[PDB]
Design a protein around this nucleic acid. Structure first.
Ligand SMILES: [Zn+2]
Ligand SMILES: [Zn+2]
Lengths: 113, 65, 97, 54, 101
RNA sequence: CACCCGGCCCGGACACGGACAGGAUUGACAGAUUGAUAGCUCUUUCUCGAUUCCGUGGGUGGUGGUGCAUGGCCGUUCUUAGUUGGUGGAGCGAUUUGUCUGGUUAAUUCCGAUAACGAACGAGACUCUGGCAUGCUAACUAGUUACGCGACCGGUCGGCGUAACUUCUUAGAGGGACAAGUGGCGUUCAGCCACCCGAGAUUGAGCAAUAACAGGUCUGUGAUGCCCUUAGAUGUCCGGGGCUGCACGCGCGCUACACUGACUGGCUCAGCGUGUCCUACGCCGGCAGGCGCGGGUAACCCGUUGAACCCCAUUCGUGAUGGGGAUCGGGGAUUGCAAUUAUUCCCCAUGAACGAGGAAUUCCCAGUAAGUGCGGGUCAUAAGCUUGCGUUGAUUAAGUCCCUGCCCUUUGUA
């Protein structure tokens, strides 16, 4: 049985929010700027915008298909319905989150405020 | 506190307990001193206990008078 | 903690097969939903992963209410030696390129 | 033992429910199946889709 | 081919109006019988909570609105044509549900 | 659920040493024990198989402490018009000018003066909502008009089925209001008052600077530094009890003191918005409710949301009275494992203060005040609370700085 339009649009909201919270706590070190989720009944795509993609992919694209296995195992949608893509940020300067994360990890470097 | 102290139960250490289960004669009569547990899984693998006035199985919790 | 070997090997072989592990952070949950029929409480999965993390074989992260675990090269080595498999087999996180 | 640990029933009541984020059981928004603390909702309202108009 | 209907539901108005208009003009140029956008009452989800975490202030309240705009477009066309016209039209920030009879 | 009484559990990772298949350890029938069918512990044996158990180091928990160590939001200063660089000018200097004599504005809003000239934030703009479109695009999940058929006397029908449509209904686009037109007053400048034409000539909000409170919150958090405890625990769980305990004093409120009113019957209108729990219809019970069978994941079913004040009849008669319904006795139902210190709900009975409230003191300018119900949040059970929505709908004012505060400018200060 299917849920109401109201509950459905809310559910998508929580999905977005929780995914973001997970992605931030995981890819904070690699300057995770934002995420974009497009959903198709064939397969839903998740697009990660981060400062240094070479790193978030991992050794021969290893870490990306750890993150894929996580969201598959957790949220419970079928395997082969998600491909976590990592697109490069157009300009890292005009992203508050990226600059905030950079300032945090250079302050943790033990530099003057 | 009003109570002196509550001590945890320590298991009484018995040495080589499975030698009390069998009584082997010189020519070889392997008699089971404790009775066999008549339940399905226990059958031939578990030797049911013999208390002062009852029987008891530690696995299936089966009891007889 | 004290748990039967069946549960331990079931958690380890799942971890090795997939390469990741997820728990829901609740000690009262009856059975892990992925390990249904095997009869493995969520508690056991959490503490098993905690025990394997403390040495430094698995990397953990915590989102809202969920534990997340990634198996490392030391973990892969440890599991292959403990579970007794030939070096040919590799996790699903180390199959593709 | 096994029959006294989590023995007390929790089908209904305030103790049965909890926030999906912080696992707190006070000031909980359970409308539209949000199932989230009022403090946590105010933090996650923007990126859920809830907007402040008037 | 009988009575396929298409339920377009979104939170944004502009994107929903654009995509639905594209589906309509895409159907119209093929010479297909189309019943136009049936605009249903906009669903407004309201949450009103205290601003403060603690509870010491002048008892101020936030007012969180969530808008849901729903459009129905109806076609008297074959399922083969309906599949491809529904396939081509994709947009992030609209949900499309197609039903036959 | 922190608090009080009493009792299980480790969910003490990892490391080092000891222990150790000649068994480290796990669980438990019976009887005693206990509030407990808790192997918790005692007697008595069984049962699991390096997962543990004992020592030290080291962790991990906390609704434990400190908001005067903190982060984040949040309130307030402060709902007023305030606020700051650059370069130039004036002072040894803190500093000042710009940021202003005077008009004008809700406004440091404008005009115009001008040792300043160029700017920036706040204000405004902006976004959402109300008010107008017989123009536009549309509609068996919204209706009208017409026609056909039917029921009952050309008429009534929310009785049913087709055709023109979008006035009514939903809601996208685009129009519309700008002190625009006219007459006065205004250094004929910024602008002000009146009036015509108009749906409207001030709709209601949201957002809101600089600089600070030793403002509140560690009891929202896997936000967090120190410290306190950490296995007879401040961890965690299970049984109770408490949070409500009443010679008294305060603060939000609800029902009243009646006749412009109670009571009984009849008549006739909403809007916001919620339903995997919302409920139509049929049967049984006075009622709370009990059964049976349907619709709805919702402009589709509840629902044409037959709401209350109000309107029209009846009885009452200034009597602490058929005002008021507190407090108390019996019963009868619904939640829930559990209702006693009575969870709510219904019926019969009981019938207190209260006759408009002393000093004092709050809130408010038009669809407002107030009366009056309905929906949302809490919600197993559930509104005297708050947060919204309609409905009936006023008196008085278009002013002032007297009280209480606010902004700018002069001065005075130990
Ligand atoms: Zn047996
Ligand atoms: Zn929360």
């Amino acid at each position: 049985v299917q849920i109401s339009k109201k509950r459905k649009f809310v559910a998508d909201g929580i999905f977005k929010a929780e995914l973001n919270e997970f992605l931030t706590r995981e890819l904070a070190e690699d300057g995770y700027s934002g995420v974009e989720v497009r959903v198709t009944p064939t397969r839903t795509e998740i697009i990660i915008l981060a400062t240094r993609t070479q790193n978030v992919l991992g050794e021969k694209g290893r870490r990306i298909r750890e993150l894929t296995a996580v969201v598959q195992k957790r949220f419970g949608f079928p395997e082969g319905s998600v491909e976590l893509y990592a697109e490069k940020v157009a300009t890292r300067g005009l992203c508050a989150i990226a600059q905030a994360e950079s300032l945090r990890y250079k302050l943790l470097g033990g530099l003057a405020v | 506190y009003t109570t002196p102290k509550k001590n945890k139960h320590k298991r009484k250490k018995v040495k080589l307990a499975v030698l009390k289960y069998y009584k082997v004669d010189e020519n070889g009569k392997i008699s089971r001193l404790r009775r066999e547990c008549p339940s399905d899984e226990c059958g031939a693998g578990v030797f049911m206990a013999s208390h002062f006035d009852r029987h008891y199985c530690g696995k299936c919790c089966l009891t007889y008078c | 903690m004290l748990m039967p070997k069946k549960n331990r090997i079931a958690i380890y072989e799942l971890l090795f097969k997939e390469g990741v592990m997820v728990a829901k952070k609740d000690v009262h949950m009856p059975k892990h939903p992925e390990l249904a029929d095997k009869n493995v409480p969520n508690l056991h999965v959490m503490k098993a992963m905690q025990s394997l993390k403390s040495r430094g074989y698995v990397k953990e992260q915590f989102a809202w209410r969920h534990f997340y675990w990634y198996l490392t090269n030391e973990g892969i080595q440890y599991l292959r030696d403990y579970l007794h498999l030939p070096p040919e087999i590799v996790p699903a996180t180390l199959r593709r390129s | 033992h096994q029959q006294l640990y989590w023995s007390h029933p929790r089908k209904f009541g305030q103790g049965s429910r909890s926030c999906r984020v912080c696992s707190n059981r006070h000031g909980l928004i359970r409308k539209y199946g949000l199932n989230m603390c009022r403090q946590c909702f105010r933090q996650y309202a923007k990126d859920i889709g809830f907007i402040k108009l008037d | 081919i009988h009575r396929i209907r298409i339920t377009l539901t979104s939170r944004n108005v502009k994107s929903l109006e654009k995509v639905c208009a594209d589906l309509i003009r895409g159907a119209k140029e093929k010479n297909l019988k189309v019943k136009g956008p049936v605009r249903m009452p906009t669903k407004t989800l309201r949450i009103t909570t205290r601003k403060t975490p603690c509870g010491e202030g002048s008892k101020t309240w936030d007012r969180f609105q969530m808008r849901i705009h729903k459009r129905l477009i109806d076609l008297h066309s074959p399922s083969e044509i309906v599949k491809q016209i529904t396939s081509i039209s994709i947009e992030p920030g609209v949900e499309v549900e197609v039903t036959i009879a």
